[PDB]
Write a protein that binds this ligand. Structure first.
Ligand code: CNC
Ligand SMILES: CCCCCCCCCCCC[N+](C)(C)[O-]
Ligand SMILES: CCCCCCCCCCCC[N+](C)(C)[O-]
Ligand SMILES: CCCCCCCCCCCC[N+](C)(C)[O-]
Ligand SMILES: CCCCCCCCCCCC[N+](C)(C)[O-]
Ligand SMILES: CCCCCCCC
Ligand SMILES: CCCCCCCC
Ligand SMILES: CCCCCCCC
Ligand SMILES: CCCCCC
Ligand SMILES: CCCCCC
Ligand SMILES: [Ca+2]
Ligand SMILES: [Ca+2]
Lengths: 81, 590
């Protein structure tokens, strides 16, 4: 599987206001038409902070048609400069 | 695994309300929902109960967490929308949806950081976006609805951006009936709405840190409604509202300090008249206001949070007869505020205090605090308390309907909330109480405003969002018990219960949305015979269905069915609602 567009998650307002960094690791599948599928959250730091923004964004992610895969894993890091 | 990296955008200033219940609506939400009015947006949101004296363009009222229609503070880019009327209630039917790029919405005790008179909540309509490109859009629906819109945002030089927008929206509408309010004879005319908007903005970065903007916009709305008919007298049946706003500002945006100095002017003219006698005839009314605001706000990052502080100045002047005050009025206000936010271990604290000096009412302070604890990873308890303060409008003191000894409404308010993330479900549940003293009402008998004692509001707010495979679920539940504490009688037009459920999914590149709403039991006054009795309206369920398809990379077509089962219902007794309505639209982007 190769990525074609992976729209960036928004930085949660509470996290930016409290100067909080972290990360979320995601696992999902890649359909024949380049749709992202069966999204799970494998780990998240800190808990109850970044998940919803990741899941939202991932709805829009598009990959290459057509080479599917099963547990494709992406780690997403949230940083404040 | 690949790593994506998300870096906080420094040009975003998040508010110190991280502990408050808040909702943001983006332009992606609005586009998808195919909303043709601002009310169609706010009605989706927790704590919000909207009523309406008909349909598009007719008066709508917003009850946040059981409070009155004037208890919601409505801001446009952080500044009060022009509100000249004696009722003191915002009518967001008149604000054009084409200007709305984001809505920021808060409710409960913390709301009054934005202004001490946000007893129920704050609705902040943001008209600016960062979205390069051009969009041309067009749409048609039931009751001869038509909309044409063009907007563009373009680089005018390397550090200078220009945004332009024009919008035209028209509907013939339907007969609102206005049962019991039309005097001797009903007016079976269709009651439509025409709204034309124009907007321009210019933003310029002097350096990476220092920026400047200037913006201007206006709209011209004509609405038809139904009114008291007496044969041989003027029938004030139509409204012409003109509005224009002009803003200019300087921002410093550093790593740790952010400062803005903004200057705003808004001029509104609201006419009600009989087309047959004319809009300048002695029979027409005009509410006209010029409002000038200067704000200076500052925020400093401090550890795990920040401290903010600022000063504001507002002047309102109204012309003779505005608010039925024979000669109009002049009102001035000077405010200072302080805010603080800090996470310490598993505890978060937030606090704000403001003081306002009013040319009429003198000096008043309000304040709020929240303390949160994450007691198990992912799970929080948050407690919060605040006060609020709302002076009568000068109309309610000095005009035809006025009572010069009216006292201000004061509110004490608390809330306790749990939030969690449990098996993919982001949930929150809170209970709240609002005690509002010296509650202001209008007396039908004597045609004057009075203080009517105290209101006591108790409520529960519950929210959940979660995804089940291809489906996204957004759910809220509200219960509100809003009573006049002296008579224990329920406050009118507030639903005891609401359920809101959004369900989104895509299949085969079609993006679908189902919206369900349950509106619970509501009391209202029957005006068809005196003394005016209270009626109870039963609960109703309403369904909307919306679909979007990207025909090409630049063209999307959308279709909507609002009230899919053509359910009859009313949010104000006597005022008919639309019934089942169809919309088709298109957006071409480049
Ligand atoms: C009582 C009443 C009513 N009003 Co006056 C009348 N006649 N109104 C008044 C009185 C004040 C009510 C009050 N402050 O409590 C009174 C006589 C001062 C008044 C004044 C006006 N009203 C006016 C009009 C036309 C209307 N009024 C109605 C709301 C017409 C009402 C018809 C109806 N049966 O609903 C009405 C009969 C009942 C209101 C009520 O019981 N609310 C109960 C409460 C719990 O609900 P609520 O939603 O929070 O009601 C609020 C609003 O109605 C607000 N409000 C009242 N009228 C208006 C008008 C506008 C434009 C706005 C933005 C707000 C209001 O006052 C309440 C806030 O406290 C209206 C639907 C009647 C009609 N069918 O013709 C009509 C609006 C038509 C439209 N869709 O735009 C005036 C423009 C009349 C004029 N030409 O000057 C004027 C504007 C006031 C303003 N901008 O603030
Ligand atoms: C979910 C599918 C929705 C498609 C319906 C749109 C049809 C346009 C109705 C215009 C007719 C009213 N006139 O006026
Ligand atoms: C073909 C798309 C047409 C774009 C719509 C433009 C209509 C704008 C009307 C602006 C009028 C401003 N108003 C009189 O205040
Ligand atoms: C215009 C006055 C604003 C009030 C803010 C008071 C605290 C400022 C103290 C400076 C702190 C230094 N630092 C590292 C956080 O930038
Ligand atoms: C006033 C007539 C009411 C018609 C009732 C029909 C309800 C709409 C059907 C929902 C569509 C289901 N789909 C599958
Ligand atoms: C209520 C606690 C158990 C939830 C565990 C689910 C892990 C995704
Ligand atoms: C995925 C096909 C859409 C049908 C949904 C309509 C249900 C009310
Ligand atoms: C409320 C006015 C009554 C006339 C007929 C009702 C049809 C729903
Ligand atoms: C440049 C227009 C802004 C208005 C300042 C009062
Ligand atoms: C689903 C809760 C609403 C129940 C109506 C009494
Ligand atoms: Ca009519
Ligand atoms: Ca009419």
């Amino acid at each position: 599987p190769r990525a074609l567009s992976r729209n960036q998650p928004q930085y949660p307002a509470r996290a930016q206001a409290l100067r909080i960094e972290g990360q979320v690791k995601v696992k999902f599948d890649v359909t024949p038409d380049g749709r992202v599928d069966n999204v799970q959250i494998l780990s998240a730091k800190p808990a109850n902070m970044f998940e919803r923004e990741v899941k939202n964004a991932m709805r829009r992610w598009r990959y290459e048609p057509g080479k599917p895969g099963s547990g494709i894993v992406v780690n997403i890091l949230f940083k404040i400069n | 695994p690949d790593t994506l990296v998300v870096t906080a955008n420094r040009f975003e200033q998040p508010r110190s309300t991280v502990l408050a219940p808040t909702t943001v609506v983006t332009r992606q939400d609005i586009d998808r929902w195919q909303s043709t009015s601002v009310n169609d947006v706010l009605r989706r949101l927790p704590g919000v109960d909207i009523t309406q004296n008909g349909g598009s363009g007719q008066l709508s009222s917003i009850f946040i967490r059981g409070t009155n229609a004037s208890h919601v503070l409505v801001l446009i880019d952080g500044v009060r929308l022009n509100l000249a009327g004696v009722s003191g209630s915002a009518d967001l039917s008149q604000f054009p949806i084409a200007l709305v790029q984001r809505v920021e919405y808060i409710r409960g005790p913390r709301s009054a950081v934005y202004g001490s008179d946000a007893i129920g909540g704050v609705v902040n309509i943001i008209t600016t976006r960062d979205e390069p490109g051009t969009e041309i859009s067009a749409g048609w629906g039931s009751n001869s609805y038509q909309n044409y819109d063009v907007s563009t945002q373009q680089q005018l030089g390397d550090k200078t951006r220009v945004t332009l927008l024009g919008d035209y929206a028209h509907t013939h509408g339907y007969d609102v009936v206005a049962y019991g309010n039309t005097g001797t004879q009903a007016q079976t005319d269709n009651d439509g709405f025409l709204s034309k908007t124009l907007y321009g903005a210019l933003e310029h970065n002097f350096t990476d840190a220092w920026s400047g903007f200037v913006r201007g916009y206006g709209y011209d709305n004509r609405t038809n409604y139904d009114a008291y008919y007496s044969p041989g007298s003027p029938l004030l049946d139509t409204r012409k509202l003109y509005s224009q706003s002009w803003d200019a500002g300087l921002r410093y945006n550093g790593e740790l300090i952010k400062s803005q100095l903004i200057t705003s002017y808004s001029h509104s003219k609201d006419y009600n008249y009989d087309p047959h006698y004319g809009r300048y005839d002695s029979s027409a009314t005009l509410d006209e206001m010029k409002q000038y605001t200067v704000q200076w706000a500052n925020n400093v990052i401090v550890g795990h949070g920040s401290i903010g502080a600022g000063v504001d100045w507002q002047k309102q002047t109204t012309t003779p007869g505005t608010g039925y005050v024979e000669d109009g009025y002049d009102q001035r206000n000077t405010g200072i505020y302080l805010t603080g936010l800090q996470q310490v271990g598993d505890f978060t604290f937030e606090g704000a205090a403001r003081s306002d000096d009013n040319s009429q009412f003198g000096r008043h302070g309000t304040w709020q605090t929240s303390a949160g604890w994450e007691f198990i990873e992912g799970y929080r308890f948050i407690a919060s308390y605040g006060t609020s303060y709302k002076a009568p409008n000068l109309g309610q003191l000095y005009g035809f309907y006025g009572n010069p000894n009216l006292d201000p409404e004061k509110s004490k308010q608390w809330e306790g909330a749990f939030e969690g993330l449990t098996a993919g479900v982001n949930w929150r549940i809170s209970g709240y109480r609002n005690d509002v003293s010296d509650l202001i009402d209008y007396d039908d008998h004597t045609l004057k405003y009075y203080n009517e004692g105290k209101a006591r509001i108790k409520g529960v707010e519950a929210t959940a969002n979660f995804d089940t495979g291809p489906l996204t679920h957004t759910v809220s539940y509200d219960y509100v018990d809003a009573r006049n504490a002296i008579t224990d009688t329920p406050l009118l037009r507030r639903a005891k219960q609401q359920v809101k459920y959004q369900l989104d999914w895509q299949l085969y590149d079609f993006d679908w949305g189902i919206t369900y709403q349950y509106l619970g039991t509501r009391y209202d006054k029957d005006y068809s015979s005196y003394p005016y009795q209270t009626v109870k309206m039963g609960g109703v369920s309403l369904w909307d269905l919306a679909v979007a398809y990207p025909v090409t990379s630049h063209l999307t077509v959308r279709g909507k069915i609002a009230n899919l089962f053509d359910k009859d219902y009313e949010t104000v007794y006597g005022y008919q609602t639309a019934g089942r309505e169809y919309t088709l639209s298109g957006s071409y982007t480049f």
